[PDB]
């Protein structure tokens, strides 16, 4: 039955990614006085299927200068980790219940970076190398702030167990307790997924296509799916951490729905930001994350360490 | 007679400094732009449902060329060749002979739509309103050779779009 | 072993997608198509040439900052001790030292590039 659970957590996520592509296109269109995909299927509902079939029926090209092994391993690592980072998510019950699921998520994200690195390096192109170096610089800028903010907001949780987040927020969303950390975490998640004002690894208007410039057909589809799956997963993480939802143990559907709606709202805000701001310069991205967030993240880490002790509100260990 | 963009110093009042700090920390202008594009989200999109809906056009539109005929049914083209002489792209090729009736009728009237600049100079130079850029603009072909129009192609085009071409001439000839 | 099963399933699914991608479509390859992309023109030099990092110091310090983040992770459990005074003083000491290192790097123009 566990294999059935694995399939019921992977296939629906891939379908959600496929339709999130269409949702993003239509949202951008309607925010640009346009109409998203509207011909292929009713209201464009068949566009993702057409895109997938085109990509997987498209000839994939293997660059002559490319290192084949890494060039093929990178896409696999990207998708596998994108699908794996959903394993510990509590909705309301996690598939795999870890005492340290949060650190597992951090480690899985840190590994996913190497997909962009190796894809860029192995592509053996100047634009791909620039994209890989930009990914390196991006992960240099956000990782420390990401971990510090996550630690500070989990100091009121009592452990790194993700399921406990539901209990901690049983009377109040944790965003009412750490909204500056919430803002900084949201921006860090934007930077991490190579997303709005931080689309520097891909850089459509500056690097043609970034690290995936030499990728076509299937592998390109896998990188896109991994990117959007990471988007949805990170938005789900933001939902569980700050926007807690009521969980009736006898009717888990209530939580599931509330959770899904919050994640959808966060993804829609991701697209909203994508169609509202110009792109950063990765020098400015690193300067922001190192000189405006990091000092403030350290200060708020001090504050959230001292607060439970000074208010006698240390959360339970178990 | 001139204006200074920028060149505006900020007030350093404690209230103004606090407002600027709040803008910096709480991202007020970013939320302002977010609200702007959110408002644009709920607008009605300006898309038209092509090909079921077609964009606005005017009687002066310069589209596919066509050789018109007199109400009698005879060609208006009397082979004066000044439409060929005025064509800035030298797309028109004209050869003429005295027809069996003895009239000035072209034997060859070839225009390569692949060289024409759709300037209209041809329809403006013609003294008998024979060559006329009609209203058709959707005549894309799968091969290059189909765009090298013959006299037969133009005559056929004229007979097909005459009703519309005439109506457009009637609507616009007073401005010409 | 369940986590191993999940990892195996994900890896197998990804590799199967790769296999289908590389064996379903009709393949027609020639030298020009597989050439590196340089916006339509031939590249001048190799892409494996040195690429200078203008933020090398930032990375070397990000190493130690990641170290400090590793040191700070046990904090949620550290609050469960009876010596809250000593624990709090040591945690604030580590955070103060991290801030001091950041400040030293900032003032000595280390966070700047080039």
């Amino acid at each position: 039955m566990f294999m059935i659970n694995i399939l019921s957590l992977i296939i629906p996520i891939l379908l959600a990614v496929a339709f999130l592509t269409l949702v993003e296109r239509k949202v951008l269109g309607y925010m640009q006085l346009r109409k998203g995909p509207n011909v292929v299927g009713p209201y464009g509902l068949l566009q993702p299927i057409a895109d997938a079939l085109k990509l997987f029926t498209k000839e994939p090209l293997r660059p002559a200068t490319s290192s084949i092994s890494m060039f093929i391993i990178a896409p696999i690592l990207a998708l596998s980790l994108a699908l794996t980072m959903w394993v510990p998510l509590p909705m309301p019950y996690p598939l795999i219940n870890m005492n340290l699921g949060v650190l597992f998520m951090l480690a899985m994200s840190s590994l996913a970076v190497y997909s962009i690195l190796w894809s860029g390096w192995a592509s053996n192109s100047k634009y791909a190398l620039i994209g890989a170096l930009r990914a390196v610089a991006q992960t240099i800028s956000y990782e420390v702030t990401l971990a510090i903010i996550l630690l500070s907001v989990l100091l009121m949780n009592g452990s790194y167990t993700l399921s406990t987040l539901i209990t901690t927020q049983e009377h109040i969303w944790m965003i009412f307790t750490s909204w500056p950390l919430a803002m900084m975490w949201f921006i860090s998640t934007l930077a991490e997924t190579n997303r709005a004002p931080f689309d520097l690894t891909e850089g459509e208007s500056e690097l043609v296509s970034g690290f995936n410039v030499e990728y076509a057909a299937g592998p390109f589809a896998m990188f896109f799916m991994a990117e959007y799956a990471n988007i949805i997963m990170m938005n789900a993480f933001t939902a569980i951490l700050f926007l807690g939802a009521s969980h009736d143990p006898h009717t888990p559907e209530l939580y599931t729905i509330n959770f899904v709606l919050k994640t959808l709202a966060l993804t829609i805000t991701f697209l909203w930001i994508r169609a509202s701001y110009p792109r950063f310069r990765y020098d400015q991205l690193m300067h922001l994350l190192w000189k405006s967030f990091l000092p403030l993240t350290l200060a708020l880490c001090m504050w959230h360490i001292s607060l439970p002790i000074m208010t006698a509100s240390i959360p339970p260990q178990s | 007679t001139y204006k200074f963009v920028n060149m505006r110093e900020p007030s350093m009042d404690m209230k103004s400094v606090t407002d600027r700090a709040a803008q910096t920390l709480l991202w007020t202008e970013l939320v302002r732009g977010l609200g702007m594009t959110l408002s644009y989200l709920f607008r009605e999109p300006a898309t038209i449902n092509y090909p079921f809906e077609k964009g606005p056009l005017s009687p002066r539109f310069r589209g596919e060329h066509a050789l018109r005929r007199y109400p009698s049914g005879e060609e208006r083209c009397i082979a004066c060749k000044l439409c060929e002489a005025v064509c800035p792209a030298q797309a028109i090729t004209i050869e003429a002979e005295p027809r069996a009736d003895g009239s000035r009728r072209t034997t060859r009237y070839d225009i390569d739509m692949t060289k024409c600049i759709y300037c209209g100079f041809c329809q403006e130079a013609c003294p008998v309103d024979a060559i006329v850029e009609g209203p058709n603009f959707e005549f894309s072909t799968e091969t290059h050779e189909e765009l090298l129009y013959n006299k037969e192609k133009l005559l056929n085009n004229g007979d097909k779009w005459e009703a519309e071409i005439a109506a457009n001439i009637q609507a616009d000839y007073l401005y010409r | 072993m369940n986590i191993m099963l999940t990892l195996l399933t994900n890896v197998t699914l990804a590799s199967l997608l790769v296999l289908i991608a590389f064996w379903l479509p009709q393949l027609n390859a020639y030298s020009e198509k597989t050439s590196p992309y340089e916006c339509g023109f031939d590249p001048m030099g190799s892409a494996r040439l040195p690429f200078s990092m203008k933020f090398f110091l930032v990375a070397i310090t990000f190493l130690l900052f990641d170290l400090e983040i590793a040191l700070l992770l046990p904090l949620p459990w550290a609050s469960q001790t009876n010596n809250l005074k000593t624990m709090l003083t040591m945690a604030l000491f580590l955070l103060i030292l991290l801030a001091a290192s950041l400040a030293y790097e900032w003032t000595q123009k280390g966070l700047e590039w080039a």
Binding site: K291, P295, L296, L298, A299, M302, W303 | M12 | A99
Partner: peptide, 26 residues
């Protein structure tokens, strides 16, 4: 005198650091 000028200037040019030192100090 000098403190007020410094703090007003600090929160006018670098308001981020002013909050961080205040939060850290508390």
């Amino acid at each position: 005198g000098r403190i007020a000028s410094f703090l007003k200037n600090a929160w006018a040019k670098e308001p981020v650091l002013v909050a961080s030192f205040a939060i850290g100090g508390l």
